[PDB]
Amino acid sequence: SMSRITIERDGLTLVGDREEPFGEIYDMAIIMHGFTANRNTDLLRQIADDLRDENVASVRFDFNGHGESDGKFEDMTVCNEIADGKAILDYVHTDPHVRDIFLVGHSQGGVVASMLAGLYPDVVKKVVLLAPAAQLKDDALRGNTQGATYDPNHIPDVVPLVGNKLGMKVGGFYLRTAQVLPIYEVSQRFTRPVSVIAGTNDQVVDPKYAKKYDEVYENSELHMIPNADHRFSGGYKDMAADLTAQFLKPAF
Template sequence: MDINIKRDGLTLRGRLERPDTESKCPAVIIFHGFTGDLGYERDGLFQALADMLTENGIAVVRFDFNGHGKSDGSFTDMNVLNEIEDAIAILEYVRKLDFVTEIYVIGHSQGGVVAGMLAGYYPDVIHKLVLLAPAATLKDDAQKGVCMDAVYDTQHIPDTVCVGGEHVVGGHYFRIAKLLPIYEVTGNYQGPALVIHGIHDAVVDASAAVRYHECLENCRLELMEGIDHGLQGDEYAQMVKAVVNFLCTE
């Protein structure tokens, strides 16, 4: 079902899917990446995960971050810190659901950065963490003055930067990104974690996943030859199965 929550005057729009039972169950929150959405396509990754997880007795909550998809806000106003604010609001929503027994979090790309830091801030609330191609290199890129095809002066960051020829990113995004304590905060989480990354990811270097593995105390790292940054490729089914098994059986 469609669900809405308020965060600082913005409406964040999402979707809740439950197993075919009235019994209490765990719930997983899925966070999408930069320019993405909660996954409206029936054949998309997030819907595939939702279908498999609900079949295995886990509820799934997905939201569009501010400035993305159907949620309120301007993309230009988005940054990692206010996506963390979104994530906290979503987490608080899930905590209040009377049927939820445990809370898990999945994050892809920039959503992985948000998910990891959220787990670091709420290590007593989040029971399992999954990071898919987590884009912690966004900090390194901001320090270099690059974002995909865009280049800018890190000492005089402009008010806006056009990325990919169509996405106008606020300069504050990069000012924040270059100083984010990504691994420091994420490392405060000590629960079970799974990090999956494509070895040949052309967008986010797999070294980011290795660093997550080093900073997370109870983490399994899977580096895959056959998936790209969008998690598509020859090992797509294996990747999905690894996530579902981790959340359902481990």
């Protein structure tokens, strides 16, 4: 609650949490959650904590339509999450305490991060992608998003989600926009260091997508964590966050 911060994007309020090390000058990471998640998953909090222990500040926001941020979930698109990310980047870049800026994203957040870094390759210093969900485009082209199915050529106004996500409804604009989203093309513009982290037992996102990220980036590392799942649950959590912190540890 001391950590609570808010910014505006187009008349929507985005709510986040800021973590800071002691001192007057520090690097900062923008940490981005995935589709249907929020800013306070175990993994994102572990990443924020490890970064803080290395003198790296962080902010983690709920994207529009998620958690405490404004907007209906059905009005969210990957594109306006990128716009959210840009508002956050304005906030961070304007801060007098902040030196270098990093992007960290998990699952769909990894797509937002990767594309935001492709739009700001001269500003973002380093990027970490954890199980980036670049599958979401092919999923949308197949008519199957998180087990919910629909006609990929007659996308209805809204598609109700299934399973653990019963009450919620994904927007048709999200699906139509995901079908044509230039994920790898825009991400490729980033030539600074990237670490990609994925689990060999990822059942949600085929790790061939993580591999393709590693292929197209001029300057990447790929970290296949043996037997890790998509969520990096259990001990995998600490592995992922550790790799993240190792990669972002500044040579101040």
